[PDB]
Write a protein that binds this DNA or RNA. Structure first.
Ligand SMILES: [Mg+2]
Ligand SMILES: [Zn+2]
Lengths: 222, 55, 52, 13, 357, 216, 146, 45, 258, 68
RNA sequence: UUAAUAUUUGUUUAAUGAAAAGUAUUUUAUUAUUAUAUUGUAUAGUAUUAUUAUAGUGUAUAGUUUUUUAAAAAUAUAAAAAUA
C-alpha cells in the first residue's frame, strides 16, 4: 500500500493496542498525510445530525447506565461454575420464581435437591449483599432467577475388568435478583397444629406467646 | 427406528402428574414453637424439649 | 524489581537477569565458531538512506 | 476499636 | 498405544471439578497440563511486596486524623443534606430512593471514627422526617465541635498512650453529639427492624460516653435492643448496669427505671416470673411512680393470675424453650439446620464433631 | 400447588457464537464503546465465582459426599517431564514480556535523567517534564509529574492499606527532547567528542538545529 | 531429540560421548585452536593447568544444615558436599581448612538435586549434593540469641 | 442447484419448534410449503 | 422506538438499521406474510410496529416483570447533568477557568491551550445535547422538584460553563439547517426551539426556587408560632444563610435576579 | 447368564442361613470351637468370642449407620 | 436426541471357615549402631509369583478387588425343599 493507515491490516492480524493507539483519535488521509482528528459520533438534535465527542459520549452512556443500575432498588448476584447440570438446575429453579425470601429460604432448607441447596447458598449471599447495600429484610422477594449453561469437564474412568467409560461433568450459572416490595403481605406461618397445641397445654407451656410491652429508645438522658 | 425427538415431545412429560408432583411442589411448614425453625408436621428435633413434647 | 522501581524511583540500567536468547542452544555450537564474511549482500541497508 | 493514630516523626535524616 | 486422561478441562473452559484439583493437588489430575499461575502471582506477591526503607518511611506521611475527620464529616453532611426527601403517595408506599452516593462518605466516616453505622439504619432515619432532623442537627453540632475543639476521643487515646508510656473527665460536647446521633441511628434501625444490628451499633456507641447519666441511658437502650434481639443475657446485664449507675444519676433521669424494666422483662422472657416480680417490686419501691414499671407489673400480674392454674409454676427443665418474639425466628430461619442439607447427619458437620476443631 | 415450568429452547439448541475473522469484529469503528451487558441488560452487583481458591470449602460442601475423585494425592502421568504450555498463556507471556527478545533496547541510548522532554503523543500530549528515571532494559522513562497514577500498598500486620500517587514508566517512542536554548523540539544524535582536559573521547548528545552538546 | 527431558528421581546420566564435549574440553584446556597444544608430558603431568589449579586452589562447596546444629546440642552435624568427595576427603577438608580434627565417622548418602517449578511452570532442578553425617566426640551447638 | 436459502431464511420466524430453531429443517419446510402453495394456486384454487 | 431508544435515552439507534450487530440479519423476528422476505416493506407504520414490538427488551427497555428505573425525577436528572459536566471538564481545568474568568473577565484566554479550548467546546456541546434530550423529562418533573436540585440546575450549567439564555453562551442559537429538510417525523421527541424552551424553563425554575424558599420560610415561621418561642436550631440557621447566599451568587453568575 | 459379579461374590463369601432361636445360637457357639481333624484349621485366639468393643478401634468411634 | 435412562451406588463394618514372603516401580525424611574409599536408603501403596535363588519354637486388631437403603414386577440363586 502507498499509505498504510495505522488501523488497516497488512500481513498482520487485528491487535487492539497496535491498531488503535488512542481510541478517541480517528486517522484519515488528507493531502497524502495521516491526519489524526478527534473521533465524533452523530446524535439527533433538533431534527439534524450533530457531531459530539465520541469518547465523552461513550463515557457518558456507560456512566449513566451504571448509575441507573446502581440506584435501582434491588440486588443482583451472579454465581458462576455451580456444580450442577443446567437442566436439573432449571428444574429446581422453576419452583422458586415469584416467592418471598422467607418462603424461598424455607423451601430450600426443607428440600432434598442439590439445586435447592445451591440456590439456598445463593439466597443467603444475596440477602447479605442486600443488607450491605441497605435494603430491608422483610420486604425482600425474588424477582428473576435463571440459569444458563456454563463450564464443562470430561472425565474418563476405567471400571472392573478393564472397560473405559466417559462422563460429562456440567456446570451452570445463577442470576438471582432480590427486590424490595413494600406492598408485600406474608401469610401467617406461626399457626400450630392442634396436636402440638394440646401437647404444650399438657406440658404447661403457653400455647400463645407472651408479648411484653417494651419501651421505646429515648435519648433524654444525654 | 429410534430418532431425534422434537422439542414438543420433550415437553409432553411435564403435562403428566408424575413430573409435577416429583420436582415442582411446595411444602406445608410452620415455625417450631421451641426451636423457632421451619418444621414440617410429623418430624421433630433432636433437642430434649422436642423429644418429650412434640412441638 | 518492577515493583521495587515503581515504589522507589531508582534508575536501573542493566537487566537484573541474564537472558540466554538461545534457550540453551548457544552451548551446542563449538566455541571457535564465527560467521564467515559474505561479500556483496543483496541488501539496501549498506547505502544508509534516511529519506525513504 | 482503636482509632487511626498520628503518624510518626522522621526516623532518620 | 493410547493415553489415559482422568479428568481434563472441557472445550469451553476449566470447571469446578478441575479447579478443585488445581487448588488442592497443585495441578490438573492429568499431569499433561503445566501449572501456570503467573496471573495470581502478579496479583498477590508483586502487589504485597514493599521494600524495607519505603515500608519504614510510610508511617511518616500518614494523613492527619483531625483533618481526615473534619473532611469526612463535612462530606458526609453534604451528602446527607443533598439526599432528597421521600414523597409520600396515597394508596401505596413509595419506594425510598436507594442510598447509592451515601455509602462512600459514610464508610470513610466509619473508618475514621472506629465505629460501624448501619446502611439500613441510615435509610430509616432519612425516611423518618423528625429522625432526619435530629440526625442532621447532631451531625452539624459534631462537625462544629470537631472543627473548633479537636477530637476528644483522639485526645483521650493520646493521653492514655502517654500515661502508659510514662483520670477521665466528663464527656465533651463532641462525644455528646456523637452518642446522640448514634442513638438516633439505632432508633431508626429498630424502627426498620434490625435489632441485632441496633445492639451492635449501641455497643460501640457506649464507648464514647463517660458521664454516668449518658452511660445509664446507653445501657438502658442496649438492654431494650438486646431484649428485642432475644439476647436475654446481655439485655439483663445492661438492665442491671443501669440500676448500678442509678446512685450517681441525676434525679430527673428515668434511664435507671427503664433499665429495671428491661431487666424484669428479660427475667420474664427467661421464664423466672418470681425474679421478674421481685425486680419490678424493687423498681416500684425505688420509683413509686413510673409507667414503664407499672405497665410491666400489671402484665406480669395478669400472667401470674393464670400461672398457677396450668402447672402451679413454670417447669425447671422446660425454661427458655418457648420461642416468643419473632426476632429469634428470623435468626433461626438463617442459622437453622436443614433437612438433609446441613445437620448432624451431614458429613461436613459430622467431621467437625469428630475432629477437635 | 404446581409451579409453572416452561422448557427453554436454549437447552435444546445452543450453537457456538460466530467467530471473528482476523480478530476483526466488523463493527468496532461504527458502534459506541461501553461495558458489556449495560446496553444488553446484563448487570450484576457481585460475581461470586466458585472456581476461586477462597470458595473451595463452599464448592466442596455444595457437592454430594457420594461423588468421589481418585487422584487427589497422586497423578497418573509423571508431572516432571518438561512439556509445552498452552497457546493462550504462551501468547500472554509473549505479550507481557517483550524485552526478552534480542536487541529490544534502543541503540544508541539518548534519554538520560536531567533532560527536558516533551510528550508528543498519547496521554499528556504537549506537556514538558524532567526525566526522573530511565529503565533501559525495558525502554521506559519515568518523567516528573507526567502519567502519575495511584499505586496501592496492602495493609500489613501493623499498617493499614495505603494509596499514594506515583509516576509510572513512559515508553521512549512517544517522548522527544527539548532544546535548552531554543526551547523547542529538536532531533538529538550521539556525537563522539574529545575533552579539553582529558585526551579520552566521550559520547555527548548534539541537536541538529542549534548544535548544542549534552553531557552524560 | 537426544536431550533427556526427565527431571525426576530416576534421572539417568548419558554414557554416550559427543564430539562437542571433547571439543569444549580441549578448548578450555589449552585454548584450541589458537594456541599450540602443550606436549604430552605437560598434558599428562601434575603441572597441567586444570590439575594444578585444582590442587593449589581447591573448589569444594561444603554447606552446614542450620537445623541440625542450631539451638540444639547435637553430636551428629550434617553437611552438604559435591558428589566427587568421599569420607576421607571431607575429614581432610575439615581438619586442614576449618580445623575440625576430632571426627569419629562420616555417614555418606547421595541425594538427587532439589527440583521445583517457577511461576510459569518451567522445571528447574538444583545441582546435586551429597549428604554427610559427621560424628564428633563432643556434642556441639551454635546458639541463636532470641 | 439453486436452493432458496438466503430468501427463505427470513421467514423462519413463522415456523415453530425445531423448524424455527434449526436452519435446514425450517428451510426444507418453507420450501415444501411454498412449492405446494404455488401448485395449489395454479391448478386447484 | 420501543426497543431502540426511549423518550429520555441519551442513546441514538436508527431502529431500522442494524449498526450494533456483528452478524448479517438472518432471521426477521416480526413477519406477518410469507412475502415479507424478498420485500419486507419495512418503514411502513403497520409493519415496523410489529417488528419493533417483537424486538426483545434491552437494558433501557426495562421489561415488564423486571424493575423500571426512576428516570422522570428531577432529583435524578440534575445530578445526571452535573456528572456529565464533571466528565467533560476536569477539576483542574475547571479551577483554571474559574481563576482566569474571575481575574480577566474572559479576556486572557491565551493562557489556555488549544486542547483545553477544544475540551471546553466539546463539553458545552455535549451538555447542550443532553439538555435537549432531558428537556421533556425536565418539563415533566418541574412540578414536584426540590430546592436542592432546582439550584443544582444552575450549578451544573455553571460547572459546564454554559450561560443559560435569559430574555460563554451556547444555548442562544439553533443548529443550522433548512426546515424543509430537517427531520420532523412524529414519534421522535425532538424540540425545535431550544433557546425558546430552555429560557422559559429557566424562568419557571426561578419562580419555583422563589416558591420553595417562601414555603420554607413560611413553614419555619408557622413552626415558631406553634412553639410560641424563638428557638431556632443552629443547623437550620446556618443552612438558611448559606443557601440564601448560594442562590443569590449562583443566579447572579447566570444573570437572573429574584 | 446374568449373575451379578458383586452379589454372587458376597453370597459365596458370607453365609445366608439365619439362626432360628437363642438356644440354637447357644448350641452353635458350643459346637463352633471344635478342632479340625484333617481340615486346614483356623486360629482360635483366646479373645475370639470375648467382647471386642474394647479391642477393635472402630467399635466405639462415632458411626453414621448407628448414629453415635 | 437417546437421558426423569441402562450398568454402577463403598467414609468401620454382619470383620472375615483366616493370617509367617520375595521381586519391579512411585515417593522420599536430620534413624541409631558396629564406629577405615565408591555405590545404591525406611515405611506406605501399586503389578507379579507353575517352569527349584520364599516354610520355621509356633503366623500384624489382617476388614476396597468385601460395595447403600421403609415396595411390587423382571432377573439370579434348585447348595432356594417341608415338591414333582
Ligand atoms: Mg389463478
Ligand atoms: Zn424443635
Amino acid at each position: 500500500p502507498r499509505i498504510l493507515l495505522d488501523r488497516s491490516l497488512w500481513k498482520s492480524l487485528w491487535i487492539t493496542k497496535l491498531q488503535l493507539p488512542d481510541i478517541n483519535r480517528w486517522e484519515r488521509v488528507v493531502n497524502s498525510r495521516r491526519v489524526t482528528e478527534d473521533r465524533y459520533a452523530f446524535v439527533e438534535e433538533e431534527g439534524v445530525m450533530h457531531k459530539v465527542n465520541w469518547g465523552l459520549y461513550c463515557e457518558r452512556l456507560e456512566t449513566e447506565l451504571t448509575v441507573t443500575q446502581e440506584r435501582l432498588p434491588q440486588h443482583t448476584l451472579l454465581m458462576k461454575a455451580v456444580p450442577s447440570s443446567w437442566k436439573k438446575l432449571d428444574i429446581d429453579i422453576s419452583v422458586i420464581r415469584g416467592l418471598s425470601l422467607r418462603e424461598a429460604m424455607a423451601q430450600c432448607k426443607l428440600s432434598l435437591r442439590k439445586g435447592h441447596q445451591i440456590v439456598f447458598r445463593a439466597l443467603e449471599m444475596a440477602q447479605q449483599g442486600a443488607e450491605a447495600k441497605g435494603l430491608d429484610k422483610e420486604h425482600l422477594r425474588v424477582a428473576h432467577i435463571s440459569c444458563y449453561p456454563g463450564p464443562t469437564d470430561k472425565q474418563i474412568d476405567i471400571r472392573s475388568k478393564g472397560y473405559y467409560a466417559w462422563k460429562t461433568k456440567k456446570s451452570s450459572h445463577l442470576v438471582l435478583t432480590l427486590a424490595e416490595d413494600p406492598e408485600m403481605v406474608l401469610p401467617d406461618r406461626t399457626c400450630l397444629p392442634y396436636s402440638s397445641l394440646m401437647s404444650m397445654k399438657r406440658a404447661g407451656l403457653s400455647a400463645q406467646p407472651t408479648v411484653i410491652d417494651v419501651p421505646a429508645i429515648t435519648a433524654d438522658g444525654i | 427406528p429410534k430418532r431425534k425427538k422434537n422439542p414438543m415431545q420433550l415437553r409432553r412429560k411435564v403435562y403428566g402428574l408424575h413430573f409435577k408432583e416429583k420436582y415442582l411442589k411446595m411444602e406445608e411448614w410452620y415455625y417450631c414453637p421451641l426451636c423457632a425453625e421451619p418444621k414440617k408436621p410429623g418430624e421433630w428435633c433432636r433437642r430434649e424439649d422436642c423429644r418429650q413434647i412434640k412441638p | 524489581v518492577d515493583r521495587e522501581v515503581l515504589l522507589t524511583g531508582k534508575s536501573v540500567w542493566e537487566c537484573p537477569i541474564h537472558i540466554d536468547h538461545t534457550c540453551g542452544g548457544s552451548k551446542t555450537v563449538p566455541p571457535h565458531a564465527k560467521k564467515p564474511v559474505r561479500y556483496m549482500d543483496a541488501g539496501i541497508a549498506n547505502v544508509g538512506v534516511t529519506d525513504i | 476499636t482503636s482509632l487511626s493514630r498520628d503518624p510518626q516523626p522522621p526516623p532518620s535524616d | 498405544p493410547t493415553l489415559y486422561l482422568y479428568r481434563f478441562p472441557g472445550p469451553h473452559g476449566p470447571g469446578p471439578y478441575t479447579m478443585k484439583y488445581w487448588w488442592t493437588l497443585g495441578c490438573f489430575p492429568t499431569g499433561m497440563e503445566v501449572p501456570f499461575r503467573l496471573h495470581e502471582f502478579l496479583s498477590t506477591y508483586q502487589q504485597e511486596h514493599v521494600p524495607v526503607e519505603v515500608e519504614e518511611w510510610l508511617r511518616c506521611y500518614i494523613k492527619d486524623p483531625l483533618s481526615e475527620l473534619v473532611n469526612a464529616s463535612n462530606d458526609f453532611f453534604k451528602a446527607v443534606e443533598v439526599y432528597p426527601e421521600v414523597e409520600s403517595a396515597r394508596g401505596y408506599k413509595t419506594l425510598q430512593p436507594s442510598i447509592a452516593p451515601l455509602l462512600v462518605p459514610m464508610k470513610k466516616f466509619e473508618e475514621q471514627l472506629g465505629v460501624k453505622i448501619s446502611p439500613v439504619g441510615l435509610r430509616s432515619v432519612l425516611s423518618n422526617p423528625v429522625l432526619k432532623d435530629r440526625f442532621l442537627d447532631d451531625l452539624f453540632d459534631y462537625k462544629s465541635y470537631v472543627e473548633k475543639g479537636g477530637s476528644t476521643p483522639h485526645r483521650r487515646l493520646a493521653r492514655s498512650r502517654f500515661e502508659g508510656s510514662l483520670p477521665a473527665e466528663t464527656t465533651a460536647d463532641d462525644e455528646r453529639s456523637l452518642i446522640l446521633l448514634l442513638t438516633t441511628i439505632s432508633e431508626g434501625c429498630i424502627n426498620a427492624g434490625n435489632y441485632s444490628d441496633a445492639a451492635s451499633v449501641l455497643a460501640d456507641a457506649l464507648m464514647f460516653c463517660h458521664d454516668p447519666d449518658s452511660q445509664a441511658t446507653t445501657h438502658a437502650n442496649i438492654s431494650f435492643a438486646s431484649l428485642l434481639n432475644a439476647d436475654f443475657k446481655g439485655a439483663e446485664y445492661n438492665g442491671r448496669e443501669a440500676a448500678l449507675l442509678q446512685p450517681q444519676v441525676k434525679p430527673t433521669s428515668t434511664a435507671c427505671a427503664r433499665g429495671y424494666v428491661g431487666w424484669a422483662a428479660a427475667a420474664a422472657y427467661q421464664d423466672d416470673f418470681e425474679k421478674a416480680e421481685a425486680i419490678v417490686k424493687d423498681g416500684l419501691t425505688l420509683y413509686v411512680g413510673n409507667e414503664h414499671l407499672e405497665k410491666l407489673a400489671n402484665k406480669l400480674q395478669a400472667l401470674r393470675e393464670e400461672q398457677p392454674s396450668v402447672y402451679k409454676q413454670v417447669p425447671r427443665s422446660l425454661r427458655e424453650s418457648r420461642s416468643h418474639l419473632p426476632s429469634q425466628q428470623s435468626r433461626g430461619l438463617l442459622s437453622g439446620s436443614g433437612k438433609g442439607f446441613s445437620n448432624e447427619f451431614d458429613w461436613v458437620e459430622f467431621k467437625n464433631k469428630l475432629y477437635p476443631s | 400447588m404446581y409451579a409453572r415450568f416452561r422448557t427453554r429452547s436454549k437447552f435444546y439448541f445452543r450453537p457456538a457464537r460466530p467467530a471473528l475473522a482476523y480478530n476483526v469484529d466488523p463493527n468496532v469503528m461504527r458502534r459506541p464503546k461501553v461495558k458489556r451487558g449495560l446496553l444488553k441488560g446484563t448487570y450484576s452487583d457481585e460475581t461470586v465465582d466458585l472456581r476461586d481458591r477462597e470458595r473451595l470449602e463452599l464448592l466442596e460442601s455444595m457437592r454430594h459426599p457420594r461423588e468421589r475423585d481418585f487422584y487427589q494425592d497422586h497423578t497418573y502421568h509423571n508431572q516432571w517431564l518438561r512439556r509445552d504450555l498452552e497457546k493462550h498463556q504462551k501468547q500472554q507471556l509473549a505479550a507481557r514480556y517483550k524485552y526478552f527478545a534480542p536487541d529490544f533496547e534502543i541503540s544508541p541510548w539518548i534519554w538520560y535523567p536531567g533532560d527536558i522532554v516533551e510528550v508528543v503523543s498519547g496521554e499528556g500530549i504537549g506537556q514538558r517534564g524532567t526525566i526522573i528515571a530511565v529503565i533501559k532494559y525495558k525502554n521506559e522513562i519515568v518523567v516528573q509529574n507526567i502519567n502519575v497514577q495511584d499505586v496501592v500498598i496492602p495493609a500489613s500486620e501493623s499498617r493499614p492499606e495505603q494509596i499514594v500517587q506515583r509516576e509510572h514508566p513512559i515508553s521512549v517512542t512517544r517522548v522527544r527532547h527539548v532544546d535548552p536554548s531554543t526551547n523547542e523540539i529538536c532531533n538529538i544524535e550521539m556525537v563522539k567528542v574529545r575533552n579539553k582536559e582529558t585526551g579520552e573521547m566521550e559520547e555527548k548528545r548534539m541537536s541538529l538545529e542549534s548544535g548544542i552538546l549534552m553531557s552524560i | 531429540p537426544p536431550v533427556n527431558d526427565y527431571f525426576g528421581r530416576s534421572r539417568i546420566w548419558n554414557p554416550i560421548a559427543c564430539k562437542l564435549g571433547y571439543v569444549r574440553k580441549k578448548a578450555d584446556e589449552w585454548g584450541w585452536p589458537n594456541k599450540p597444544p602443550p606436549p604430552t608430558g605437560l598434558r599428562y603431568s601434575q603441572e597441567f593447568f586444570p590439575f594444578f589449579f585444582e590442587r593449589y586452589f581447591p573448589d569444594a562447596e561444603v554447606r552446614l544444615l542450620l537445623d541440625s546444629v542450631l539451638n540444639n546440642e547435637t553430636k551428629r552435624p550434617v553437611f552438604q558436599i559435591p558428589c566427587s568427595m568421599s569420607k576421607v576427603e571431607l575429614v581432610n577438608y575439615l581438619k586442614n581448612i576449618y580445623g575440625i580434627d576430632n571426627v569419629v565417622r562420616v555417614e555418606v548418602r547421595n541425594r538427587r538435586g532439589r527440583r521445583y517449578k517457577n511461576e510459569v511452570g518451567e522445571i528447574k532442578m538444583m545441582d546435586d549434593y551429597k549428604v554427610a553425617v559427621v560424628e564428633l566426640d563432643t556434642p556441639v551447638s551454635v546458639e541463636l540469641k532470641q | 442447484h439453486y436452493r432458496a436459502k438466503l430468501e427463505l431464511d427470513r421467514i423462519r420466524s413463522m415456523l415453530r419448534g425445531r423448524a424455527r430453531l434449526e436452519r435446514k429443517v425450517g428451510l426444507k419446510r418453507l420450501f415444501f410449503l411454498m412449492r405446494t402453495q404455488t401448485r395449489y394456486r395454479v391448478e386447484q384454487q | 422506538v420501543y426497543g431502540g431508544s426511549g423518550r429520555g435515552d441519551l442513546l441514538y439507534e436508527n431502529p431500522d438499521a442494524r449498526r450494533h450487530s456483528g452478524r448479517a440479519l438472518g432471521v426477521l423476528n416480526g413477519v406477518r406474510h410469507s412475502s415479507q422476505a424478498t420485500m419486507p416493506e419495512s418503514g411502513q407504520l403497520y409493519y415496523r410496529k410489529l417488528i419493533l414490538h417483537s424486538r426483545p427488551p434491552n437494558g433501557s427497555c426495562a421489561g415488564l416483570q423486571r424493575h423500571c428505573h426512576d428516570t422522570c425525577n428531577w432529583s435524578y436528572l440534575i445530578p445526571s447533568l452535573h456528572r456529565c459536566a464533571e466528565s467533560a471538564i476536569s477539576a483542574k481545568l475547571w479551577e483554571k477557568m474559574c481563576q482566569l474568568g474571575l481575574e480577566d473577565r474572559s479576556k486572557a484566554w491565551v493562557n489556555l491551550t488549544q486542547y483545553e479550548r477544544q475540551r471546553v467546546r466539546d463539553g458545552q456541546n455535549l451538555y447542550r445535547y443532553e439538555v435537549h434530550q432531558r428537556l421533556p423529562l425536565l418539563e415533566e418533573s418541574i412540578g414536584w422538584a426540590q430546592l436542592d436540585d432546582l439550584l443544582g440546575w444552575f450549578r451544573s450549567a455553571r460547572r459546564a460553563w454554559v450561560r443559560l439564555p435569559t430574555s460563554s453562551s451556547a444555548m442562544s442559537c439553533r443548529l443550522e439547517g433548512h426546515a424543509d429538510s430537517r427531520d420532523t417525523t412524529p414519534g421522535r421527541n425532538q424540540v425545535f426551539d431550544t433557546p425558546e424552551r430552555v429560557e422559559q424553563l429557566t424562568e419557571a425554575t426561578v419562580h419555583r426556587i422563589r416558591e420553595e424558599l417562601q414555603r420554607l420560610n413560611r413553614s419555619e415561621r408557622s413552626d415558631c408560632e406553634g412553639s410560641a418561642a424563638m428557638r431556632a436550631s443552629a443547623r437550620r440557621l446556618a443552612r438558611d444563610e448559606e443557601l440564601s447566599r448560594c442562590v443569590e451568587e449562583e443566579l447572579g453568575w447566570h444573570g437572573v435576579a429574584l | 447368564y446374568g449373575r451379578r459379579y458383586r452379589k454372587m461374590e458376597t453370597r459365596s463369601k458370607r453365609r445366608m442361613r439365619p439362626y432360628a432361636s437363642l438356644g440354637e445360637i447357644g448350641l452353635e457357639n458350643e459346637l463352633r470351637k471344635e478342632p479340625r481333624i484333617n481340615a486346614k484349621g483356623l486360629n482360635n485366639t483366646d479373645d475370639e468370642d470375648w467382647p471386642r468393643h474394647t479391642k477393635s478401634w472402630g467399635d466405639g468411634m462415632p458411626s453414621m449407620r448407628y448414629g453415635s
